[PDB]
Structure formats: structure tokens, C-alpha cells
Amino acid sequence: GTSNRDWWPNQLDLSILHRHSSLSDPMGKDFNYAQAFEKLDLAAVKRDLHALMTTSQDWWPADFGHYGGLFIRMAWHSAGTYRTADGRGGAGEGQQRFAPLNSWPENANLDKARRLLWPIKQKYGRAISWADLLILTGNVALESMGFKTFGFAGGRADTWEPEDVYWGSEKIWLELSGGPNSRYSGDRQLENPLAAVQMGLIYVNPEGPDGNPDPVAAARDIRDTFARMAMNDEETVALIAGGHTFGKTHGAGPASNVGAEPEAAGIEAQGLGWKSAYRTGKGADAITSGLEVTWTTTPTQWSHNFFENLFGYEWELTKSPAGAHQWVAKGADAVIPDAFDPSKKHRPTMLTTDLSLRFDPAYEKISRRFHENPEQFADAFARAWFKLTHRDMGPRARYLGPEVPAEVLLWQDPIPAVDHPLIDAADAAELKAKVLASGLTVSQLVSTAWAAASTFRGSDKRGGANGARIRLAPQKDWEANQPEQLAAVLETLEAIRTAFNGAQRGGKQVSLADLIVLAGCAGVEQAAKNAGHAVTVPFAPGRADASQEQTDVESMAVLEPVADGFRNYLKGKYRVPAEVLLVDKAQLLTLSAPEMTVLLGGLRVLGANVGQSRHGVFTAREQALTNDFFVNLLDMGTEWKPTAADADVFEGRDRATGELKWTGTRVDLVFGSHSQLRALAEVYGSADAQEKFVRDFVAVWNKVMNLDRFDLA
Amino acid sequence: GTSNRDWWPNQLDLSILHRHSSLSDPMGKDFNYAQAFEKLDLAAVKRDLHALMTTSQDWWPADFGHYGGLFIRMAWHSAGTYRTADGRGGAGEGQQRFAPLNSWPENANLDKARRLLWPIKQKYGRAISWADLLILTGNVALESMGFKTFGFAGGRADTWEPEDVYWGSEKIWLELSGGPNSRYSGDRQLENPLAAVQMGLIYVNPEGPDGNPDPVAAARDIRDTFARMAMNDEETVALIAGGHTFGKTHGAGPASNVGAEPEAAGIEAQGLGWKSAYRTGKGADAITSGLEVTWTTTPTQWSHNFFENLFGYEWELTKSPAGAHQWVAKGADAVIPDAFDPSKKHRPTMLTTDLSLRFDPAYEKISRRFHENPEQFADAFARAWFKLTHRDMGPRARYLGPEVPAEVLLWQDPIPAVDHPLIDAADAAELKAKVLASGLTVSQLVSTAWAAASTFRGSDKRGGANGARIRLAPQKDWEANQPEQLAAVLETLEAIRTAFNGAQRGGKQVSLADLIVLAGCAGVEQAAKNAGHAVTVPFAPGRADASQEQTDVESMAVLEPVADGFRNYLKGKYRVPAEVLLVDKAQLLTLSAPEMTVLLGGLRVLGANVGQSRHGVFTAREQALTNDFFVNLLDMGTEWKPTAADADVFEGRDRATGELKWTGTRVDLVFGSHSQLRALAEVYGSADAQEKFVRDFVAVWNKVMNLDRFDLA
């Protein structure tokens, strides 16, 4: 069937904005997963998981009688798709059970692991999500094998369709770099926002870069990809050596024996894949990666034997039975148990990437310290395993259950507790009037609140106006936030705040975070008044102010908006057309196409553009909340053409006279070009739409202001 | 960005079931278009449309000073995509404004027509939809040019994204037949459900079949494609001759001058396309089809000149200025006016397909009768224009406004008005108990009501249980309806009905259409009781019984279900996999993925399969409403394989013993294979889900029983 995507492959795709509809969700509109989870008997689930670990099924027999290592890999892969650039991937939505991830080559045979969990999932039903169950299982695995975890939080609600993620442009699974769709260029520079080295890999190639078994060059790729998943050297070493304390790899025969991945397999496979014609196809004969390595002398028990082997032997390059490069210990005895035959033992083996931890000089220093001090290694691994599995969950307020760690960690972008009465509706009215009497303008008020709130991204639930981090490094200095204007506004609001808080009794006070949002509410209200319309913008207090000491400046850099079409802003020149970047921002903000449309049309006429650019400001009553952007854009009296100086800026001229009326970017004019976006523009630019435009603008403004308010969930 | 569609192009696409969500719609959830339209000042809209006709814009100057022809073509094309096979296409959703239809080659320059209507759309806003406006404009154009229309109904609500329609498999616009994706095979057999001869045409090629200018062979294509749009010979000749009484075609220079269609055009084109480098690119120099034909001596006035020209000259094959085949009158004088230069006249000309109306012997007879009796031609064209523009609107109860014709037309599948008190709740309980005491089984009750209600399709709003047409030809004889079983059920229900009606006072009676539905409801109630659940199934009376004389047997044939996965039925062997057909059926029933899932799993255990097939009947308590279908399907204790005899039938065997437990089709097992459908199955197969399953089944059952109830809204 030929589709629109076939005929017009470069046209913008709005369907990413309309996933997660109430249509595709099997649970009722009123289902609240947190309420369900909070009544789960978590202890009972963990005792069923503990039993499962040593209850082998004959369709996928357990290595060493224990599924622990399989399930640790499962959980690590669930979390391991995470990219800090955009916050997409990670374990937080249980996406490993849908396409494409369920059929990526590096997820081979995790179909079996997830099928092992069905009886448990079935037993507890809606009170435990697949998303949470995958993580919990990896925890129970670690526990069952003698490792003390840092804790666990529930609350990852299940999703019901594949997430729209750009995973790369390659058309071949695992394609080596330098192809027609190479994710690499320059001196091995991996393209943003990707955080893996080949399409269908979690981080790096276990044989070495593009299959070259050089541990020193492989370390480079490990360091770069882990940093793109927000893990530093200590965390990286802890995680790789920690995971590879357990279990084994599977490469018992040639890979050509392995059949279709789950999405490609026959209907009779009933959602499983990688069916193997090599001997029994499973157990002793399993093939997953094609490597055949077992790291430790007790693969089903926590130990410090990974580093004892790493540092106590010298290593020789060898090949698995599938032909993959791997390493064996020179002159070693057979000390490693076999997974099924108790009369057989094997020499220690390592992946190229394991040896990276000894042959890269910075990793070597950490690895030696972990070898000499295995209590340090155990604590680093527990903390890193927690971060790995929780990094995309969002603020601590979303953490459910009896095992949440009490320690507040810097990577959580923590927000202090509120310990005082909040402002009431009369206070909020009084503050709005004080803000408007200060002489701050609509443009200043709307721009500041937009800058504070529009850092949120729903992909990992970071960002938002909670915290008042807009006043702190690095946000206060970002170009899009207009640092000198911003500083002036914040000084005036901090004076308003000091005066209001000094006059109270009873401990009542207002945070700057709340007052920034409220002040933006007053700007929207005043703009509505400027247009002849009395509206109240909703406001919910209870945000708190974080300190600089509670803010990791390097982790916050990924939240900088380098492209924000809501402020007509592009920090530099990109490959990707600015309209595509706008739809990507809308998706991160959780906006639909109609919400994106209303919000951008209003923000243009409110003066929200960076630098006071006139691009898209299609009004003669700036700072009034009207639908002029739509009326003017859709006026066929005006003809548009790209400028000679810059093809991405357009002049709108009177069609009859030639007189210059306006200028606009691609982000402005897409609303008059794309057939679906123009239909939306037509609704708001109709003669009956002023009241609708105002109400829908207020609604979407308030939505953006509240994106991070999981305290009100 | 490589997508799931790229990796697994044969995997099933459920996003067709979740279009048209409240996310994509700019209107609020309780916007009711009918209510808005009923308040529109339709008379005012019409006066503005009359004014527009002759208000020429310089960017697309009006031929002959009057846009009437262009607008008639616009409305004709809006309606002309309609296929009787599935009911998809047509004017009823305004889809000419979205991809792909806004950019189909035969829709060239209709972008201009729609842009000429924007000021009126803007002025009346949500009170008139694009969908209604495109049809009303066509009507006004006719009226302005002297033709009295048969009527007009409003009520076509706008839609907000492209409809999912299979338009063909060709990857080249306009590709002639016999290519790798040919819509033709055998002796020119067009593939169902297509109703046009080339990709991007409305019906046929105006030069003749595959470009060969043979009017007799073109006639064959015209007859076949019009029949596939629900039009017979008389309607066909009236429509082509009526349309071509007006306006002109455009082909003033070579087609290579024409640039990108609207979805391919630059952002500066602001939604328009087909920009032409030939001379002024418009007006006298316009290029649309490449033909240059003006049919009549008065192209802006209703006349009887079409048939006078057709029969009064003999015709010679010639070429337009773009190179296209067309026909010129032998030895004629220059009598046809020029569209822009009063000093120029032209000889009469005709398309190949216009000469079909003279040279095909059966059309010749009609055409001559129209020529000799022009009052007949006028009345047939008025009726056929009404039908063309309203054929996809559904029952008359949906028709809005003050111009709706009072005459009831057979193609509307009319239902008689109800003239008597309806049954109340006490009566319904009395009838359900009578039905259950008669000895009809759960299987029979459920099967019969499903058979009656599941003929509905949302595409053109035909079908459904209202009318009791299940008792009439041809529905009573369809193989999927199990004609001998059906007859026995209807005899028993008609005796119940006669007894109940004979005991009433005050004119109260029940229709058989109501009783069939109510009896289905009693079957579902009984099946819940069989499972230990006390459940009441909602029922709304008020359906009426249509007569055989109100039921066009040939038009009803397109509703026959040749594939109904809900009854595990497939009439023969198809090239499309049966699970794709199930999703296509779900779409026509307006079901989402979770509704399709719950429905099919319940129908399987209630005994709704055709012929009592055991395929998918995964329960040991048939006729009890339980979630057994899901629990058993997802059991990993069972292994599935295709049979040797038939690859589309699967045996499910105990994994440990090899013993046969079940058999299923592709429709059954897809719910265990597709990763999104399996996620839905898991919800209903969980230990906490029996009550959910029952309540969701009742809801979707009710939904299906009321799909055609436009008398209740």
C-alpha cells in the first residue's frame, strides 16, 4: 500500500505528537498506576522472583541452574538505551517489550527472559507494570546472589505502543561505521543525540571498535558512549565489572544457525525470536552474541573474582566457536565452571571491552582501587546500578514503595521540601498586581516564565520551573534565556518577594520558583486585558528553590535549548530543518499539534522571541493576546519569498503593491504550508475564534507551567 | 531516521485504529458540529458564494469571468474518490484538503479553488465545515449558472488528519497498467477495493485506457469504475454530460512547465502547488490536465449544447498544445468562446471519454434520449449530482438544514419512521425472558445479533442492525450469516414477536430489528450468568423494519463480509493476510485496538464462529463469558505450529507431552505474536482481570449494537 511517507519522504511527521491516546490504552481513563502499585505486596512479588531464579524451564534452561545473570542483563538493557542528549530511551516506559527494541540484535534472547516473567506479571496484574517488573527482577537477581542493592523505586507506568525515537539512519542492523548512513564523522565523533556506536547495540561493540580487538581503542568508545548515558569513569568501571561478575555470554556455534528476530519471525513463534538450528538451540548450545566467555569462578555469586582474574592473568586473543574475537588467560588452569556439565571446567576468559578496564590508563587506576578495596567496588556498583535503573524516572516525588533510598543524590536535581504554609488565592492576586505595578512588561514576564518552565522534557522528566534553577548556573547564562534581561527581571521579582515575605505572619512565604511562574501568569492576564478580555490564569503554588550546591552544572548542560521555535531561536546552523526541531521540542513538552499551534501563535504576539526579533510577530498590537498571528499568516493578500541573504528567512509582501509587511522563519511559515498544521491555523484564524484562542492559550500555558509538578499527582 | 515500518514492512499497523483521537482534534471534546451547523445562516453563506463566483483573483484568474466550472470540478472530485467496496473516500470528511489527495495529479489547481474559499470559511468558522463547504460551493456554482439542484444536506464534520485508505500499490504517479504493482490483471479486471484506473486519477484516463484513444474501450473503463462508485449507466451519462456542459480543460503548453505538487512544494508556496513556468502560469496560459477542450458555446450557462455538439459533428483525433490526445469537430466553424480574449473563437472539441457517450452502444441510447428529451437529462443530472455528493453520508437522520430533499431515495437504504410507542424496561425484561425460555442458545443469540449489527461501516455509515435487513435478500443468504441456522432463529424470534405484539394495547409494538438486538443482549446476559457474574447489558429500542422493496439487493452486496475475523471466517483465499483483514474490519467498525481485542476474545468463547469451528475456541466452558481465550492463548505450556495440510491453521500442543490442546487461525494467534496486541492480551489474561474483561466486553458489544443509531444522535 503506497503511503504519504512514500510519496513525500521529507515532509514533517506530526503523528509523533498524537501517541499515547486514550484510544490505544487498555486501562480505563481513571486508572492511576501509582494508586495500584501502592497496594501491591512488593515483598510477596520479590519472594516469587527469588523462587523463579532457580526454577528452570526446559524451553530456555537456566545456565548454572540460575537465571540471575540473564535477568541482570535484561534490566541493564532495559535501562541502557538512555541518552542524556534528549532523555529518550531508558527503562522508564518498558519499551524493551515493543519494536524496535524487542528485536535489536544486542537484545537477543531477552525475549526468553521476559517470557519467564509472564506468570508473575499475570499473577499481580495491573499492580505491577512491566516497566517496574524488569527492574525489580534485576534487583532480586543481585539480591539472590549475595549483592546488597542501594534500593528500588516503583512508579514507571506501562505504555502501550512504541516510543518515536531516532536511533540512527542506518538501513542494516549493526552496520560498521563509514557507510552511506554513518553515525560517525571527524575524528570518531558520534552524532548527537545517539549514544551507541552501531545500530542495534546498547553502547559499544564487545569485540572492539568496528570489530577491531584493541582494548585501548575500545576504551575510547566506552568512555564516550557511557558519558552520553550520563555515567563517568568510576560509574562505568563499577557497572561493567559489576555486571560481568555474573553469568556468561553465549556463542556455542556459528551465528548462521540463528533465525529471525521476534518482529520478523512466524506467527507460531508467539512473540519469541532467534530460534537456533545449532544442536538443542538452547542451554549448553545457546547462541546470543556469538561470544563464549564466562568471567568468574562463581558466576551465580557476588565476588571480587572479576578483578582478580583481570589483574592475575595475561590475556591472549582467541576466537569463539562462532568466530568472534575474545580473550583467554595464558597458562591458566581450568577453574571456571561449565554451565551444564559438572565434570567440565574452563579457563578464564574476557571480552576486549573487559580488558579496556585494565589497559586504559585512567580506568586502570579505578580498577586497581576496586581490586584492592572490594568494599569500595561494591558500594560504587550499588549506587551506579540504582542511578542506571532510575535515571529517567524524574523527580523523587514520583518514587513509590517501601524501598526508596533516603539519600538524596545530586543527579536527581533535587528540590527541597516545603516546610511552611503556601500562598492562597487572595495572596496570588495581590502578588500578580504587585508584579504588574513594578513596570515589568508582558514581554518580560512571559519570556521569563517560558524560559524557566520550558526546560522540561517528558522523555526523562527532567527540567521545569520547579527549583528556580533559572537563577543559577548554568541556566542563567544560556543565550536563549537572554542573560542580561533575565538578571534584571529576577532582581525586580526578588525585591517583590522579599517585601511580601517580610510582611507575613505564621511562617507563610512564597518561593522564587512560584513567583516566577505567577509573574508569567500575570503577564498572560495583562495581555488578555490589553486585548479586551478578562481572564484568570490558573496557578498552583508549592514549588521550592534549589541551591547552587544542589545543582550539577555539567548534567544541566543537556537541558540547554539550542533550538526553541517557541522563541524563534536557533543557536547555530543545523542539518535538521527548524520545523522538525520544533515538532521535536513539542514532543518533549508533551504537546499535541493543536497545543503546539496555539502556544506558538500566542507566544509570537506576546513578545517571547529571543532578542525581540520581529520574525513571526504578525501583529500591530504586540503584548496583546489575540489570534493575529493566524489571521495575518493565512491572508492570501500577502506573498512570501526567501531573502537573498538567508534562504531560511522570508519576506511577506503585499501581493498588489509590493510593500514589505512582515518577515518570518521556517518555523513561522510552516503553519501556512503543512497541510495539517494549516488546518489547525485555520481554526484559530477564523472570525469566530478569539474566545477559543484565548482559552486554549491559557490552558496550554498552564499545562507547560505544571509539567514538573509531580507533587500535585 | 530508520522506522519500524522500514525494518519489518510486513508487520501489521494498528495506528489506523487510533487516528482521529481527541489529541489531533483542535475542537473541544464536546464540540458538536451538527449543533453549530443548525445555527449557521445558510442563506447568507450562499449569497457570499454567489458573489465569489465572479470575483476574479489575479493569482488565479477566472475563466470566462466565472469560477463556476472550476468549483463544479472541485466538488465532483471531492465526491469522486468514493469506492462502494469499502465505503472509503468520498466528500463526507473533507479529505481533499489533506495528503495525498490534495496533491494527486488529477486534483491539480483545486488547491487554487480551495484557497478562493478561505475568506468564506474564515468568516463562518466552525459553523460550516470544509467538507460541507466544498459541496455547497459546487451547488451554488450550478445554481449561479442556471441549473436547479435537487437539494443539499449539511452535516459532514471536518476531520484533522489523513484517512487511512489503500489507494493502490504503484510507486509512480499515473503509472499505466501491467507494471510490478499493476492494479489490473486478466481481461482488464481492476483489483477490489480500487475504483480508478491509475494511481492519482478519480475514475478514468481522459485520453483513453492507458493513454490509447479508443472511445469504445474507454467506455468499458467508465462503466466499471462508475459502478464501483455506485452509479449505473443512466447516472453515469447524466453526470459526465452534465459536468461537461460547463467550463473548460487547461493545457495551454507543455506539461514540463508545471512544478511540484503542493506536498512537495517549498514552504513559501504556502500550501499551493503546480506552479507553472509557461508564460503567465495561469488564466489564458493555465495547465492542469494537459488537454485543451471547451465543450459548449456557453460555458458559464446551463444549456443542451453538450449533446447537440456530441451528435451534430463527426470527430477527428488531434493533439492539444501539451501533446495530449483529444478530438475536434470536422469542418466546424469557430463557435466556442475563448476564456480570456473576446476576439477569439474555437471549434468544438471533446475528450475521448466524452465520445464514449456516443460510441458505446448502451450509452448511445441514453445519450440520444437525453438529447431528444432535455427535461429528462436535467432531472437525471440533478438526482445523480445529489447522489454523488451525498452517497457517503449515511442514513437520512444525519442530513441537516433547510434544503434537504423530502423524497426518499432507494440508495439511502431507507428505514421507516416509527409511528408507535416503544417498549420500556419492563417489556424488555419480559422479552429477554421469553427468548431465553424458547431454547435459543447463547451461541445462536450472540451469532445472530453480531451478524445483524456488524455490517456497519463508518466509512460511508451504511449497514447495521437498524432495518432488520438480515431477514431480507441478500443478507439472509450470505454464507457468513449461516443461512439455515439464521432462518431457524428468525422463525423463533418472529413467533415471540407476534405473541408479544398481539397482547399489546395502545399501539405498542416491537420491531424485529429491536428484538434481534435484544435477544443478542439476552444471550450475553445468560453467558455472564453461566460464568457466575450478574450483568445487565444496556439496550436502546427504536429500530424499525425495512421492506424488501426498500432494500436494493445489488447495492447490499458490497456489505457482504468475505472476511470477518470476529467470526473466524474467510470466504476464500486472499493475497492479504487474514490479520490485516481483521484490522481493516475493526477500522470500519470504528473499534480501537483494545476494543477489537476484548470483542474477539469474548466472541470466541460465546460460540460466535461460523460453522461452530473450534479454531480459537480456547475454553472448556463454551457459552460462558470468561477471559479464557486470553489466559489460554498466553500459556507458555503450549507450543504452536502450522499444519502440513494448511499453513494458515495452527496446532497448539502441550510442550511437555505433545498432546493436542487447541487449533487456531492467523486471526487467533496474532494476539499472541504482534507485540502490541500481545500487550493488550496480557491485560485481559491477568488474574485480576475477569471483571474488567466482562465489563469491557459489554461495553464494546453495546457499542457495536448502536453503531447505526443516528436517530439517538
Ligand code: HEM
Ligand atoms: C561496555 C559495556 C558492555 C559490553 C560491551 C557488554 C557486553 C556483553 C555481551 C556481548 C554479553 C553476552 C550476551 C550473550 O551472549 O548472552 C553480555 C552479558 C552480560 N552482561 Fe554485559 N556488557 C557491557 C556492560 C554491562 C553492564 C553495564 C552490565 C550490568 C551492570 C552487564 C551485565 C551483563 C551480564 C549480567 C551478562 C550475562 C548474561 C547471562 O548470564 O545470560 N554488562 N555483556
Ligand code: HEM
Ligand atoms: C469519465 C469521467 C470524467 C473524465 C475522464 C473527466 C475528465 C476531466 C478533465 C481531464 C478535465 C480538465 C481538468 C483541467 O485541465 O482543468 C475535466 C474538467 C471538468 N470536469 Fe470532468 N471528467 C469526468 C467527469 C466529470 C463529472 C462527473 C463532472 C461533474 C458532474 C465533471 C465536471 C467537470 C467540470 C465542470 C470541468 C471543468 C473545470 C473547469 O472549468 O475548470 N467531469 N474533466
Ligand code: NA
Ligand atoms: Na526516556
Ligand code: NA
Ligand atoms: Na467514505
